[PDB]
Amino acid sequence: KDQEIKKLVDQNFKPLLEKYDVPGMAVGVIQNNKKYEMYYGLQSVQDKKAVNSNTIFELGSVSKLFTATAGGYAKNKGKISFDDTPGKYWKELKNTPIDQVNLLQLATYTSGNLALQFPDEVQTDQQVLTFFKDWKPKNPIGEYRQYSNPSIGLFGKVVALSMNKPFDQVLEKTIFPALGLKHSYVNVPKTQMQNYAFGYNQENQPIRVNPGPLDAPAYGVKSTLPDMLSFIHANLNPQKYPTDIQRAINETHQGRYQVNTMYQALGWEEFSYPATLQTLLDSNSEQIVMKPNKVTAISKEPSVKMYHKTGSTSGFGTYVVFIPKENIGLVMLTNKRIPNEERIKAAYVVLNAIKK
């Protein structure tokens, strides 16, 4: 019964606040089109402001799901193609070597040579433009997955160029409204700053995300629990949404390659359902997240799929998971990072106990 969802989240999520000294947490569940919101603790320790439905959290790498979506929207408005190259859109890179990698390989982290972060050195628009002009290849393109902010960041910049709008306006004026999101931002306006949580570092000091190269497309979206539940809703039921955005969403669900049990989609990670706990943990292992791994063609096309994505900034943790054919999903938002494995497991227990 409905009356168990609250209890299961208290048993599995609530203990984490004490175990990691997390000030504030928002956990959302959606099941059979009914939304449940559970709020714990404080958005701001110093203000004694409680987490609530208005609280804005940093999504970290969960922002990549929005970037992927924006990319799917542009592929279906004819504005780009995933076999295309950066040159067609960033006039300044037309024939250089990074005008050899495709928009898909960028989005899915399999260029020869891109790490997790730009070098600290790189910051201005001209330092990014020049980091990619004097970019030179390395690995057999397409063969190796290495998870990367620059790669999908560059995908994002290009998606934005094709729609003739800077990336931030593509999300706030086009993508967010089409998803019906009311309080999701690349830049949080002044009128909403009172709702923007403090994040907290491992020294429990209050912090928020710092400006960085191509931050908006790689990790720069902020949102509320209601909005993320609406995003999960749309992923679970894109039939009700405008046809452009429906097509964008389905585009982000298509698996592109395997790295072992993990299928890489656009933004999302995909698994065969039901998946074992360990399968889901492996997607966030040092092996998968930090090191290169060789990518194989999809062999088993799972009949029933599930999808997840973890995300962090220095001050915030996020996890989102959904299973289309159970018509369920879960969103966890914290204003202190906790281990990825702890996010994945609590969600696992909750969604299996409800799978009834």
Ligand X SMILES: *[B]([O])([O])[C]([C]N1[C]=C(C2=[C][C]=[C]C(C([O])=O)=[C]2)N=N1)[N]C(=O)[C]C1=[C][C]=[C]S1
Contacts with ligand X, residue ranges (CB under 6 A): 60-61, 149, 212, 219, 311-314
3-state secondary structure at position 239: helix
Shorter beta-carbon distance to ligand X: residue 5 or 56: 56
The yes-or-no answer on residue 61 being catalytic is yes
Region label for 48, one of left (φ > 0), alpha (ψ between -120 and 50) or beta (otherwise): left
The yes-or-no answer on residue 20 being catalytic is no
Shorter beta-carbon distance to ligand X: residue 202 or 276: 202
**Catalytic residue of the set 109, 147, 219, 257:** 147
Min CB(61)–ligand X separation in Å: 2
* Residue ranges of E strands in 48-191: 49-50, 57-58, 144-145
Indicate the residue whose CB is closest to ligand X.
61
Taking residue 177's Cβ as centre, other Cβ atoms within 10 Å add up to 14
Distance CA 108, CA 1 (A): 39
Shorter beta-carbon distance to ligand X: residue 26 or 320: 320
Min CB(88)–ligand X separation in Å: 27
- Tokens 């690995």 locate to 139
The two counts, helices (H) then strands (E), for the chain are: 14, 15
Min CB(219)–ligand X separation in Å: 4
Shorter beta-carbon distance to ligand X: residue 167 or 219: 219
3-state secondary structure at position 42: strand
- Alpha-carbon torsion 276, 278, 31, 253, what sign? negative
Task: From 348, 215, 332, 230, select the one nearest 281 (Cα to Cα).
Answer: 348
Distance CA 155, CA 161 (A): 10
Min CB(293)–ligand X separation in Å: 16
Min CB(209)–ligand X separation in Å: 7
Distance CA 118, CA 219 (A): 13
How far the first Cα of the chain sits from its last, in Å, is 9
Shorter beta-carbon distance to ligand X: residue 149 or 184: 149
**Active-site positions?**
61, 147
